[PDB]
Amino acid sequence: MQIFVKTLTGKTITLEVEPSDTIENVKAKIQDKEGIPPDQQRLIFAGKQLEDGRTLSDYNIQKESTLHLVLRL
Amino acid sequence: MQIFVKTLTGKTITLEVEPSDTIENVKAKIQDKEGIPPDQQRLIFAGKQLEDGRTLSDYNIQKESTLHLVLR
Amino acid sequence: MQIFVKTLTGKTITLEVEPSDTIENVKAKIQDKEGIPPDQQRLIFAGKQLEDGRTLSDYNIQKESTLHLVLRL
Amino acid sequence: MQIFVKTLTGKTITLEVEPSDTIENVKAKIQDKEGIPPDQQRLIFAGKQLEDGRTLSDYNIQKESTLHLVLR
Amino acid sequence: MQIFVKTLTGKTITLEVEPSDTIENVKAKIQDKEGIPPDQQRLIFAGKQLEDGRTLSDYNIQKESTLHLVLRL
Amino acid sequence: MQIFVKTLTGKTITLEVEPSDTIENVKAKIQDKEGIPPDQQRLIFAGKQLEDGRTLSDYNIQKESTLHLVLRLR
Amino acid sequence: MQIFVKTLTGKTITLEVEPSDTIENVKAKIQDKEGIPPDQQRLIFAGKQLEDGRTLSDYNIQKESTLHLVLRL
Amino acid sequence: MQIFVKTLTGKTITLEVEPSDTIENVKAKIQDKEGIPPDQQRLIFAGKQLEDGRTLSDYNIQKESTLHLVLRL
Amino acid sequence: MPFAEDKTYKYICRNFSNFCNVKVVKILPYLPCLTARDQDRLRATCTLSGNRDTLWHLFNTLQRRPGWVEYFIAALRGCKLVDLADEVASVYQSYQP
Amino acid sequence: MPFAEDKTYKYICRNFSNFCNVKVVKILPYLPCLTARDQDRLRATCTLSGNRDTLWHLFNTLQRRPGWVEYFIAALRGCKLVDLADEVASVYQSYQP
């Protein structure tokens, strides 16, 4: 499954995850690709906070669904 | 990689920089060609003040871009 | 005095009226050259029906004004 | 009244009539020069169908006026 | 007195009816004129179901007033 | 009667169909001209889908009327 | 300074005046040119009646200005 | 500090006023500068009849800020 | 009979000054046709805005429930208030098909 | 009577301070001429924005309803506003042709 992680700067990141994947594991995937630690990561999907311990299928992320990644210190 | 920092006086400025340069670089190039000490100017790009630390690429400055210069 | 009434097909006609005439008097005088019977005429001025019993001056019409003549349905 | 009624093909028909003359006078004289039966025609003046009984002056059809003759 | 029954298909059907008639009478002749038997019919006037046994004048239906016909299922 | 169906590709398909023929018949003609399986098609007539069972006259599709064809893709 | 005065008849009146002149000077001096009695005039500038007493410069009347003249009749 | 006193006619008066100056002093400055009596003024700034007792800094009138001077009868 | 009942409600609206006798809190127990939600609105309105203002709410609410006139009359004379009840009935039975 | 009833409403607008004492929710039940839609829109407005912000809507909604005047006086003096009722009536019956 393909998802889009759109940074605030506009750059779009594509990830291969499964709907059973944890948000924590997803945050690790963004951390791998361009180095933002999961602590500084805060994903927003459908205008909603993504709680850290829950899987994507809980929020119903499908293929090519887009997540917004906003960084806070 | 050309930029045009428009001046209140009305005369534009031809500055040749590259996105790698930070603002103190372009401020210095402003310090050179015009004579304003860098601390006394404040570049502005489409209503977005340029923080001194950052680089022109951070603000998506591209070829033939037009900045703005305000004194004091 | 010299008032206009415009038939609904466009052939406006000039009338030699007096302000204090009852509307019958103006209505009665279309027939004298045109021939619609008084019951058929439904005069309209400034979007207000003209009840026949009252007078022209009652509805505050000045000279050279226009009246709209629409046939009774 | 000399009028310019234009058919589908685009060719215009000139007609010497009078505002006293009614539409059948226009329609019947088309038969004498065009042959299309009077029931077939229906003339349109500025998007308004011409009732046959009424006369041209009823519709403000003045000198050099254009009529549309749509067949069928 | 003429009334209309605008079926949802758009088939506008003219009915000649007297105001004193019952609704069954309208329901009866609408079958004879077009064809649905009454028990699949449901007259709608003024956005209000019409009782079977009532007269037309009880609903204050005037001439040229248009009923609506829907199909009971 | 003679109708046109508009495809996503832009090219419009002419069809020699009678008003009696059902949507199955008109959809089979699409396959006979292009090859898209009838299930894959979803004929649309002026912002309204076309039931597979109803004939064209039910939807009031006279001559030279246009249709829209959309294909379940993945 | 010169000023232009329009008229109902369209015969535009050109004048030779100076700003400190009062309208009493303007209104009277038309009479000696056009014969309309000073009381008969009712002169308009820019859609604003000009009072008889005051002067042109009060209303910002400038060179080659276009006054409007309106009579009672 | 410069401020501008703009009457309703349109003319603008520049005034060399100090921020601690109370309104009556400003009205007094209008006296010698123009000639309007001290009571006849009505200083209006940013839509607010300027009270006579207060001072400019109380209303926060900055440099080259404009006052609308309106008259009484 | 969802039309003869509807006409009856128009009779009550016109002759409203007759019905000010009936008190809502003393009639509400005798109206099963009122839902447990609508009873709460009436008892709250009656407590808030007096009784007379509530009568229009009772009738306007009552006229929506099916077969209300039959219960209303049965309830309306359930308050020993028979002289006014039988009138709503004379409006009703004298208008059935 | 389409022209006297129009004039008395024109009278009410120009003499509107006299009607400040009318309480809308105590007068709506005694106005049968108002349709059940209007009696529900006025009460909603009265509940939302006080009473005297509704009086103008009530009178501006009465003057549409045909034959509203004869009801209005009956409502006014049914609301113990007899002195006001006689004065609005006087405008009516005096102007009758």
Place this chain on the structure above:
Amino acid sequence: MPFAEDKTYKYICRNFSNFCNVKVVKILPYLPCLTARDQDRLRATCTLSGNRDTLWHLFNTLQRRPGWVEYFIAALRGCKLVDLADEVASVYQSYQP
């Protein structure tokens, strides 16, 4: 006093959570300055949407009424909120000329 009244209202806004104890229905009788329409409108909002959603409407309507501060203080300390009334006074005459 058009100006000291103006700022006193701004103090009320800038220190508004101090006034949360003011009960509207218990203070309206104490405010003659409020016009018969506003009293009717505030009492409707208070009923519709509670009390503390009306406080800001009470103060925003008071500040237009003439001489409200003198009435507000007298009302406020007449409502046993003396510790809050003198706070408003300690602004008003502490800002008078």
Place this chain on the structure above:
Amino acid sequence: MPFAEDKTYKYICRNFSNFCNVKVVKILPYLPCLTARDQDRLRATCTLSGNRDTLWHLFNTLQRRPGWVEYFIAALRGCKLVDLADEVASVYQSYQ
């Protein structure tokens, strides 16, 4: 726990008919999470338009507040209304 609380409100909205028994005027003292302003709003709405027309306003106002489910369950069984109280918990605690 901004999600298990979030679903639990969707559970209450879905199974809302079971909550008709909750009397708002008798439950508000048991819900400290509701601020002083909302208690005034709910009490006024309960006074203006009955009880069961306020219930939906109560829950839709509870679910804003932090840690409401923990309070609501205690309030629900504190109001002698326990058959429903354990239902709400069994939806909340089940989904941590």
Place this chain on the structure above:
Amino acid sequence: SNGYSTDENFRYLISCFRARVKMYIQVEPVLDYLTFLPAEVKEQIQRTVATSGNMQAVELLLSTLEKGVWHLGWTREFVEALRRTGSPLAARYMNPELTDLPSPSFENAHDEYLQLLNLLQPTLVDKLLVRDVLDKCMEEELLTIEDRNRIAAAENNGNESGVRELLKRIVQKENWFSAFLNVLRQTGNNELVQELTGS
């Protein structure tokens, strides 16, 4: 059935009844079903609606169809656009087949019924009230689902703006007058029908 082609016949009809259908065509919703129209053209027509009003845009729409080559079968695409956008009266003047168009008496009579509102619009604009005539108007089915949205929106800046814009919508529906008099009658506006008819 026909004695010519199908494209010039339609170009002729929009050249004959241009002044007629200009009244009956609501160009804002009809643009949805004109798929053959390029999006840039529809934008220009769309902008004209907001700038110069409906009847000017319909002139532009009928102008741009008249001058310009389109895909085959646009005529029935246009006519079908009119039918299901809720103004079938304009469709009667656009069928290349002729029996659909109204009888000359009907078209003539509905010129007076139109002029009767324009004379009496100030009376209607006062006494009418969109909050209650609107819903009963849809039941009579002379206001489309899309008109009611635009009526209710024009009601936002006043009632009279709703009426001024209802009376602009209903004059485009087939046999609207006798249908309108009903809508007045099953509402409280029994006074208007007397003013609007003289009974």
Place this chain on the structure above:
Amino acid sequence: NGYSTDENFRYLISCFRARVKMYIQVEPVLDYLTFLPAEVKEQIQRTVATSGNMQAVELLLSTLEKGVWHLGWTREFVEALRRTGSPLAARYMNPELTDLPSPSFENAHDEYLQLLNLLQPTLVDKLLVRDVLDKCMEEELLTIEDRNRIAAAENNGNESGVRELLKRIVQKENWFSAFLNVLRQTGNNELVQELTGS
């Protein structure tokens, strides 16, 4: 006298063109104008909603100037203004110039409007169109068309209502003196002293 009636009126809107667009409320006046073709009354209705009232009145007067209408239109236009709730313009338009306001009145009410423009931020703040409308119709400086328009413009905030009211009154006859009367009858007595400055 001594001339036609149409050209008497055509002159009289070329003089007071600037004076009357302040006074003409063109949204309702179009109903009473029947000579105007509907495709022109639609454009003016759009210019109202696109470029505001004062632009449409320019368009209305411009479209009346150029182009010839059937005789007797001038009385239909004046009668439109007189009874649409804009009688002040009807004094100017009236081709019999008997009723035009005296220059002192026009000057004074040109000052009052200018004064109201300065003090609009005060009014917009301190005015409450909830309690002024019902007193405006009593003094008859508002019309049910205007009172509907204002009350529907206060739905998006009170101040949007006041900004609309201060456009409608300044067109009415002798508005300032009667407007002060409304503000005195209502509780807004503090505005008057802040508006009349005494």
Place this chain on the structure above:
Amino acid sequence: GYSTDENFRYLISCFRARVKMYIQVEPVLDYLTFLPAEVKEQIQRTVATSGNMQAVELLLSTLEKGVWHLGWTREFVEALRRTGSPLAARYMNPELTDLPSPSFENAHDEYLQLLNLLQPTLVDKLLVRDVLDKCMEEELLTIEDRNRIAAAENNGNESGVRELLKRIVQKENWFSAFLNVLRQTGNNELVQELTGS
């Protein structure tokens, strides 16, 4: 063509009439982050000045033209799905799997015409405060809608049902769901009028 942006765009032309009817644009604009802040505020104003359907056509026209970040069409669909307009989400979906069966689109179109015919019976005999609580259980109303209906009900129950009926018709399988709302409430007579049986 095959691009999902072109695929979506063509699908709009096919269904532009259907989806103008099914999109409640006021809440969707929250979820459309990619739209410029300027356009979103103009669409909000078009709602108030020229009605909903003129705003949707403004939204769709401004969505079609203008390249957006890839995968926007699914963000737009997910907006419609969870702003209480799931029926439009069926059409918008370019992969076209979830398109309502033509029988559904036919049947749930004559149903919509059925309400417009019987709207006065409903409005006279249905009161929203009685139905809103149960209508949310069936989840054919979102909190967005119930607030709007209860707020529109403030100026009269008559206008409340004007707004409830305006909103359920955009919800998926609404008629069969709406009756279940009516028959689970006391409105066992309205369900008799809607379906006759």
Place this chain on the structure above:
Amino acid sequence: GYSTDENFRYLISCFRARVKMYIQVEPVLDYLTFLPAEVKEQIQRTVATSGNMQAVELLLSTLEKGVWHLGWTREFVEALRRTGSPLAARYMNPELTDLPSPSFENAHDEYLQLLNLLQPTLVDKLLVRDVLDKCMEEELLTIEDRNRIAAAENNGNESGVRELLKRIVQKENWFSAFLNVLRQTGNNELVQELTGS
């Protein structure tokens, strides 16, 4: 070294993108007396038909083109200062002294983007009824703005929040103060979700 009209016109050119975002133009027109009444009407209509941000663009265009009476620039700044949009007054000020630090301007651009991302959370989990009174106490909403937030809330809570979120973002130091407002009321769940802690 120049006049004030010269550089203030320049500051519009430099910052036309910014103050387009921070100017609430419907109430600033009251204080702009120099504008002819036939232009204040056109702008007031552009507000009501094409959104606020398009009217601000028209306003800045129409100020910069024509020449106005001397000292106009101070009416505009003072209008912005006291109409409830002080952040725009910092940029528009020809003194160019209170202009916010470039880090501050950046930081509140990220917050504004974040708010746009999280708008459907706020609109769903925020009650303007219980947050308005705490806004004026924090002076981040003027009585103008509350009067129109409370009036756009009349057609539903959610539409009230859309209106609130468009007028806090123009205020000064809004995010720090907005969170202080949310913390002070009961909405401590939002701040845990808005600031991510």
